[PDB]
């Protein structure tokens, strides 16, 4: 499914497409007690990389917190920030920025 969640310059917010997407996570999650993810947060490269950093935390929070709030065991969620520095797009320009404005969701 899809394990990928993207954003909109400087935001953290969700859309009703990612609520959808989050949701069938939230339901095997809490269907499969020993299955855990790690929740990566990621900026495209425009601003500081401490600045990017706590924005990555930000997305990657969002993402935790409506895992949680869905009823989500906490011990089965982990969400950690990459900042700016590992894009999946190394390009220069909208088309390689959004690719890289998202939160992961990684399956141990």
Same mark, same amino acid.
């Given at each position: 499914?899809?394990?990928?969640?993207?954003?909109?310059?400087?935001?953290?917010? #969700?859309?009703?497409?990612?609520?959808?997407? =989050?949701?069938? &996570?939230?339901?095997?999650? *809490?269907? /499969?007690? /020993?299955?855990?993810?790690? =929740?990566?947060?990621?900026?495209?490269?425009?601003?500081?990389?401490?600045?990017? *950093?706590? =924005? %990555?935390?930000?997305?990657?929070?969002?993402?935790? /917190?409506? =895992?949680?709030?869905?009823?989500?065991? $906490?011990?089965? #969620?982990?969400?950690?920030?990459? %900042?700016?520095?590992? $894009?999946?797009? $190394?390009? &220069?320009?909208?088309?390689?920025?959004?690719?890289?404005?998202?939160?992961?969701? /990684?399956?141990?």
């Amino acid at each position: 499914a899809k394990r990928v969640v993207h954003f909109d310059y400087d935001s953290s917010d #969700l859309s009703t497409e990612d609520y959808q997407t =989050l949701q069938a &996570h939230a339901q095997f999650l *809490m269907a /499969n007690a /020993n299955s855990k993810v790690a =929740l990566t947060g990621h900026t495209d490269e425009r601003g500081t990389r401490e600045y990017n *950093m706590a =924005l %990555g935390e930000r997305r990657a929070k969002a993402v935790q /917190n409506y =895992l949680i709030t869905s009823g989500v065991n $906490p011990q089965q #969620l982990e969400a950690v920030s990459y %900042g700016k520095e590992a $894009p999946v797009n $190394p390009g &220069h320009d909208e088309s390689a920025w959004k690719e890289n404005r998202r939160v992961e969701i /990684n399956y141990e």
